[PDB]
Amino acid sequence: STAGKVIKCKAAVLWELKKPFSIEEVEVAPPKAHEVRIKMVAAGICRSDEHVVSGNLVTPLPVILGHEAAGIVESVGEGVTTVKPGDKVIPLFTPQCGKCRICKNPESNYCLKNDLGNPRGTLQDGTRRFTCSGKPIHHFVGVSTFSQYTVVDENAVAKIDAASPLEKVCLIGCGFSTGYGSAVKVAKVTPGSTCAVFGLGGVGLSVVMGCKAAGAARIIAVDINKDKFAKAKELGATECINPQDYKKPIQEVLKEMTDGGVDFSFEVIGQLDTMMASLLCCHEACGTSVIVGVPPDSQNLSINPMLLLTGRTWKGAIFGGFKSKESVPKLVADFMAKKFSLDALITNVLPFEKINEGFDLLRSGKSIRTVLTF
Amino acid sequence: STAGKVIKCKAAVLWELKKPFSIEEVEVAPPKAHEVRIKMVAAGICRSDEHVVSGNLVTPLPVILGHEAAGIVESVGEGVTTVKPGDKVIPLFTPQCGKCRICKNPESNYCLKNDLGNPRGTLQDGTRRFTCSGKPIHHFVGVSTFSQYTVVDENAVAKIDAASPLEKVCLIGCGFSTGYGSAVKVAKVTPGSTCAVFGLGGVGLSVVMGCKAAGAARIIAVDINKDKFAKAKELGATECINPQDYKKPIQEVLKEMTDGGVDFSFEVIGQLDTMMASLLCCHEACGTSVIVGVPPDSQNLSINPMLLLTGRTWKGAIFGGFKSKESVPKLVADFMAKKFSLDALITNVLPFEKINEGFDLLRSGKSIRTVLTF
Numbered sequence: 049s050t051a052g053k054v055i056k057c058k059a060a061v062l063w064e065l066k067k068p069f070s071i072e073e074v075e076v077a078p079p080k081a082h083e084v085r086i087k088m089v090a091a092g093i094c095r096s097d098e099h100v101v102s103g104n105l106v107t108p109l110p111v112i113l114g115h116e117a118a119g120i121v122e123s124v125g126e127g128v129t130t131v132k133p134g135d136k137v138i139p140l141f142t143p144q145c146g147k148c149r150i151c152k153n154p155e156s157n158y159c160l161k162n163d164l165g166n167p168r169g170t171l172q173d174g175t176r177r178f179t180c181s182g183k184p185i186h187h188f189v190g191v192s193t194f195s196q197y198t199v200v201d202e203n204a205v206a207k208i209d210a211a212s213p214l215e216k217v218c219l220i221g222c223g224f225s226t227g228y229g230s231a232v233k234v235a236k237v238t239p240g241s242t243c244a245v246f247g248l249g250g251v252g253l254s255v256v257m258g259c260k261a262a263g264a265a266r267i268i269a270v271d272i273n274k275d276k277f278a279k280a281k282e283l284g285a286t287e288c289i290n291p292q293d294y295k296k297p298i299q300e301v302l303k304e305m306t307d308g309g310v311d312f313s314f315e316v317i318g319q320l321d322t323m324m325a326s327l328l329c330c331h332e333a334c335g336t337s338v339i340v341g342v343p344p345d346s347q348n349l350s351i352n353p354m355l356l357l358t359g360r361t362w363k364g365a366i367f368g369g370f371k372s373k374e375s376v377p378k379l380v381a382d383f384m385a386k387k388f389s390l391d392a393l394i395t396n397v398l399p400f401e402k403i404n405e406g407f408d409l410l411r412s413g414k415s416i417r418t419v420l421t422f
Numbered sequence: 423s424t425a426g427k428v429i430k431c432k433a434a435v436l437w438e439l440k441k442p443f444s445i446e447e448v449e450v451a452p453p454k455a456h457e458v459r460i461k462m463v464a465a466g467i468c469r470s471d472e473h474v475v476s477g478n479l480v481t482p483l484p485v486i487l488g489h490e491a492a493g494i495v496e497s498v499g500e501g502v503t504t505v506k507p508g509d510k511v512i513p514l515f516t517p518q519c520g521k522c523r524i525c526k527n528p529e530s531n532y533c534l535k536n537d538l539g540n541p542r543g544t545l546q547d548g549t550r551r552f553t554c555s556g557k558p559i560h561h562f563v564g565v566s567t568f569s570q571y572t573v574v575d576e577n578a579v580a581k582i583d584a585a586s587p588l589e590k591v592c593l594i595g596c597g598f599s600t601g602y603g604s605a606v607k608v609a610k611v612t613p614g615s616t617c618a619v620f621g622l623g624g625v626g627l628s629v630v631m632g633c634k635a636a637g638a639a640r641i642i643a644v645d646i647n648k649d650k651f652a653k654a655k656e657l658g659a660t661e662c663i664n665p666q667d668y669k670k671p672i673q674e675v676l677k678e679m680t681d682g683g684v685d686f687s688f689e690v691i692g693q694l695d696t697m698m699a700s701l702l703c704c705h706e707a708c709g710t711s712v713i714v715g716v717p718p719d720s721q722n723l724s725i726n727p728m729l730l731l732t733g734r735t736w737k738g739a740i741f742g743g744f745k746s747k748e749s750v751p752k753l754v755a756d757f758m759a760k761k762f763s764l765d766a767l768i769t770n771v772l773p774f775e776k777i778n779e780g781f782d783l784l785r786s787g788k789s790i791r792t793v794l795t796f
């Protein structure tokens with residue numbers, strides 16, 4: 049048994065910005081009251097993990113990254129009632145404490161227990177459960193899934209269908225839920241409408257899927273990488289455009305294609321130029337622009353408020369606006385009923401040991417989601 | 423009769439920025455086939471008219487301003503079907519053509535026939551109906567109500583209850599509907615929510631009324647002029663604060679008062695600093711901030727997109743988001759059914775000829791709405 053004991057296991061540790069992950073042996077303390085230790089089965093590689101490597105998203109180093117994952121509960125601390133050993137689960141980078149102002153508000157999901165805003169790199173009690181040869185190792189957004197075992201707070205873990213294929217449903221831990229929810233729950237795309245989606249990674253394609261589920265008439269997929277277009281069309285895009293092809297700014301291109309602008313635009317890249325273009329490309333009277341991509345820390349846009357006065361809405365969200373713990377089981381249940389499929393988003397499957405290869409596939413533009421198997 | 427003939431009458435003309443209006447003898451052409459010539463009865467003085475005088479809102483000069491009004495139809499073009507000579511009517515500075523993409527969208531109201539953004543100062547056929555000593559004068563927002571007679575497009579006039587008191591319901595032609603709608607329709611203020619309203623002029627007080635009607639639990643009225651506070655309390659505000667009383671910026675004061683920020687914030691002034699403060703004072707995870715005020719023509723806000731990414735919604739609207747021609751009769755009918763009262767907003771009544779005194783009252787902070795009688 050490992051229960052009650054310190055586990056020595058393999059993890060991918062980032063010691064320095066802009067450097068490869070190091071496969072280290074690390075020490076993983078057992079779960080305290082209201083904590084859950086998880087044995088990872090599958091972890092996806094998301095651009096947000098790469099934002100930390102590049103220094104675009106600041107969090108304390110050294111760190112174990114990883115936040116899109118599925119696993120099986122090895123054990124639970126005192127007081128835990130919602131999961132138990134052997135349950136299939138998905139760790140929640142956005143917690144759902146169920147008690148804070150935000151958790152009680154039916155329209156919001158950014159729980160006050162998150163470690164996203166001002167990152168400390170700990171669990172909710174303010175300490176770390178990882179050491180690598182006595183040196184302490186920071187957590188990432190409470191979940192740190194690029195390790196064979198991790199420890200997370202009870203309110204940051206969801207119990208899912210016992211029959212769930214973890215190598216696929218890990219995507220519901222971040223990329224798919226974020227993209228799909230940004231369309232169906234944050235934008236609330238109306239049927240018959242026209243949508244523009246900027247960026248066709250795992251998250252952008254899931255936005256395409258959500259717009260299709262919502263009944264959009266037109267979904268205009270925008271990417272500088274034309275290799276992304278075939279999958280975008282497969283998942284419901286009606287047209288694909290590459291900004292590099294044009295002398296005009298892409299917002300003007302989109303407005304001229306759509307009788308003055310789209311009804312719903314989504315920025316799913318994380319760049320200020322495209323966030324501006326996404327806002328400007330939605331119709332000034334009836335358009336809604338949603339920020340999904342995470343911009344580099346603390347860089348500003350110059351905004352003429354006249355852009356909003358005529359009737360536009362500009363908004364953003366974390367995790368597709370889904371309240372994490374109650375939504376994740378439902379989305380997995382939808383997956384099990386084949387309401388949507390995730391296979392098209394999973395381009396590569398590698399053993400955990402090949403994390404760096406999986407990141408290079410992401411940086412190269414060649415992959416959508418690489419899933420790491422433990 | 424005057425039907426089919428040029429009418430000679432008086433109008434208040436603005437010949438130059440930052441100068442008084444001049445009461446001039448003008449000639450008003452008969453209406454063309456889908457136009458309506460109206461005899462004015464009552465016109466309100468809105469800050470938006472003063473924005474043109476001060477150069478804050480750009481429009482071609484020389485011009486006849488005025489857009490908040492009620493009157494009696496003198497004559498119609500032959501293709502007119504929705505009003506007749508003798509009907510009471512409110513001119514619509516936002517038209518409702520009933521045909522365009524925006525008019526057919528249930529959620530939007532900024533009809534494509536508008537002369538609001540990028541104004542030409544004409545009627546919808548691109549021509550003008552006013553002359554002074556035979557030389558043309560520009561219209562304002564399609565309506566030009568500071569004149570004893572004006573001509574408007576049919577799609578920019580609503581027929582109202584023949585029994586209604588025109589010296590009161592003229593406010594439904596702008597200030598009241600804009601504020602009220604901004605709360606109930608644009609923000610969709612929810613029962614038990616907290617709201618902050620920046621600016622307590624006729625429009626801001628109408629936002630206070632709307633938040634109260636929607637059942638907000640707290641309505642924090644913000645004004646640098648504390649003489650505006652007693653009326654705000656009368657109309658539903660729970661608290662009134664003056665930013666100048668505090669050592670910290672008003673957004674931080676409001677966040678600390680409201681467990682992290684209001685659910686709905688409204689900027690009802692037209693200044694960039696208060697648009698920023700209003701955005702920042704709504705809660706980062708669940709807040710909605712609405713721009714109502716008209717910003718000055720040449721200025722930008724500096725916005726970090728992270729402000730929206732956590733879950734904020736930022737939007738603007740014209741005329742409270744009301745589809746003008748269908749809504750204005752219903753709001754007049756609500757008034758006649760005693761659902762709300764307008765008397766608190768009307769602080770001064772003056773003859774048309776004393777228009778410059780009415781603007782002086784507005785500029786000195788003394789009035790809410792002055793209504794001019796013809």
Ligand SMILES: NC(=O)c1ccc[n+]([C@@H]2O[C@H](COP(=O)([O-])OP(=O)(O)OC[C@H]3O[C@@H](n4cnc5c(N)ncnc54)[C@H](O)[C@@H]3O)[C@@H](O)[C@H]2O)c1
Pocket residue numbers: 093094095096099222223226246247248249250251252270271272273276291316317318319322339340341342343365366367368413416731
């Ligand atoms: N808000 C959230 O809850 C949330 C959650 C997950 C990820 N994200 C963010 O969403 C964004 C997308 O993540 P992903 O994993 O799908 O990324 P990805 O790197 O797989 O995909 C991004 C896509 O954008 C394209 N692209 C890059 N620059 C472009 C430009 N200038 N113009 C047009 N296309 C461009 C790329 O070619 C790529 O196809 C990232 O910023 C990520 O951090 C946000």
Ligand SMILES: NC(=O)c1ccc[n+]([C@@H]2O[C@H](COP(=O)([O-])OP(=O)(O)OC[C@H]3O[C@@H](n4cnc5c(N)ncnc54)[C@H](O)[C@@H]3O)[C@@H](O)[C@H]2O)c1
Pocket residue numbers: 468469470473596597600620621622623624625626644645646647650665690691692693696713714715716717739740741742787789790
């Ligand atoms: N979007 C629309 O359809 C629409 C329609 C009508 C009016 N408006 C606009 O709404 C705004 C308000 O119109 P109004 O007629 O009520 O104006 P108003 O001048 O009567 O009132 C504005 C109030 O804001 C207060 N104020 C000024 N500066 C302030 C500051 N820095 N901090 C706090 N309070 C401040 C003033 O003391 C005053 O009470 C104007 O910009 C006007 O153009 C917009």
Ligand SMILES: CCCCCC[C@@H](C)NC=O
Pocket residue numbers: 094096097105115141164165189222342731732
């Ligand atoms: C609020 C800033 C945090 C945004 C980045 C979150 C990211 C780690 N989540 C999923 O990819």
Ligand SMILES: CCCCCC[C@@H](C)NC=O
Pocket residue numbers: 357358468470471479489515538539563596716
């Ligand atoms: C497109 C912005 C122009 C808004 C000016 C509207 C104003 C004239 N209406 C009422 O005050």
Ligand SMILES: [Zn+2]
Pocket residue numbers: 143144145146147148149150151159160161
């Ligand atoms: Zn919570």
Ligand SMILES: [Zn+2]
Pocket residue numbers: 094095096097115116222223
């Ligand atoms: Zn992610």
Ligand SMILES: [Zn+2]
Pocket residue numbers: 468469470471489490596597
């Ligand atoms: Zn007005």
Ligand SMILES: [Zn+2]
Pocket residue numbers: 517518519520521522523524525533534535
């Ligand atoms: Zn129209």
